[PDB]
Write a protein that binds this ligand. Structure first.
Ligand SMILES: CC(=C/C=C/C(C)=C/C(=O)O)/C=C1\CCCCc2ccccc21
Ligand SMILES: CC(=C/C=C/C(C)=C/C(=O)O)/C=C1\CCCCc2ccccc21
Lengths: 214, 11, 214, 11
């Protein structure tokens, strides 16, 4: 209740209108600023105590961004579209040493989003659910964050069973990409931690801050 | 810690 | 269609009536045999080509077993119940060096399963969905495996919206533990690979086979 | 590879 899909969609439309790995890290730092503004546009998110807002964003920033550039890449042939406006083809990513993860992104996320034609409203609700992760360690009131998560998918299901009546399994099919997003979110994080360790691959301040402790 | 994140959230 | 929740429940009832880490690895090897019999009891699972049956089990054995001992541990105070009949208390697991993961199991899985009172029929359908992972690499017909996954949660939702009419968000709440199960499934796997590397901690043949390549 | 798994699935 009090979690309209319209406010969520607006949040999605409001924020978004040589080494392939470097370009990706730069695009990630860039989007981290936009991610905060986005979250602020999510209903009741700003009513949470600052500390809890920090925990939620630091907990899902990686999954929230991977989902976004994937959906944006639905029109791309064999690759993804970066916020910076650059394309990263599968062959290019492969020649950089991150072909395994890249393929998982195209196969488990991009392709699947394209086949069911996930709309922006559906994307938004999914990211909102990811944002409202009640399992986040440190939350001063997990039950509260839990309450918001349920309100989000309550609106999403209503949206689906109203926009796509012919597809009664669309709602479940949307939630069934979260496990893959969690898995891919974790692998990507491993890569970032390795890149930081090695030294090569420039990492900006905000992206760098996210790789802090915990 | 989380210097930048806090600033962007408060503004 | 042709995927009754009764067959699934029966499958769950049919299979199940000093170092804490060692006892856990032994219990894992033990359950791996029971897992196969279980799967065979899952509708249409045996109609898939042997090679695909191998891929599906090797892909989800870890999540399928973690979910099962967690649900079984719902009655436990602060710990889990092993198939072997042994209890592993949180303090004990902590003193073994696996306290971080153990806590995540009690907090994100056991506790959450206890609060909503997930029933065996719900547990079964969830594991069935995990078993039918269409993202598994190597599948000769992913679309087919995909079809079965949808039939499973189609029956589960019907079951829920018939057994717990007062809780319209129960279905989604069940699927919303998969991301956590995927995450916890991966961390546990890391531990097993480390234990094998180090040398200590005896690992039986079947458990050992699962840690093969890929 | 997967010697045991195959045997248990065939039986
Ligand atoms: C964690 C991450 C944030 C994505 C940022 C973007 C791209 C934002 C935007 O441009 O929309 C994803 C990464 C960066 C770490 C290396 C592994 C990796 C491999 C293939 C594709 C992406 C990634
Ligand atoms: C992967 C795994 C299979 C579980 C097997 C059982 C327990 C089966 C049953 O007795 O029902 C889970 C493990 C084993 C690896 C070490 C990390 C770990 C830490 C805490 C709890 C469990 C685990």
């Amino acid at each position: 209740e009090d979690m309209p899909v319209e406010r969520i969609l607006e949040a999605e439309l409001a924020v978004e209108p040589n080494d392939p790995v470097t370009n990706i890290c730069q695009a990630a730092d860039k989007q981290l600023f936009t991610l905060v503004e986005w979250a602020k546009r999510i209903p009741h998110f700003s009513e949470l105590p600052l500390d809890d807002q920090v925990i939620l964003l630091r907990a899902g920033w990686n999954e929230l961004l991977i989902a976004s550039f994937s959906h944006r890449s639905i029109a791309v042939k064999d690759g993804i579209l970066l916020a910076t406006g650059l394309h990263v083809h599968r062959n290019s990513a492969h020649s950089a040493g991150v072909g395994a993860i890249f393929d998982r992104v195209l196969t488990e996320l991009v392709s699947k989003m394209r086949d069911m034609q996930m709309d922006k409203t559906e994307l938004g609700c999914l990211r909102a659910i990811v944002l409202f992760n009640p399992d986040s360690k440190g939350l001063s009131n997990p039950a509260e964050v839990e309450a918001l998560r349920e309100k989000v998918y309550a609106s999403l299901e209503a949206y689906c069973k109203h926009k796509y009546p012919e597809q009664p399994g669309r709602f479940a099919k949307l939630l069934l990409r979260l496990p893959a997003l969690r898995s891919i979110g974790l692998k990507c994080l491993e890569h970032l931690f390795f890149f930081k360790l090695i030294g090569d691959t420039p990492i900006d301040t905000f992206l760098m801050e996210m790789l802090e402790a915990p | 810690k989380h210097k930048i994140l806090h600033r962007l959230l408060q503004d």
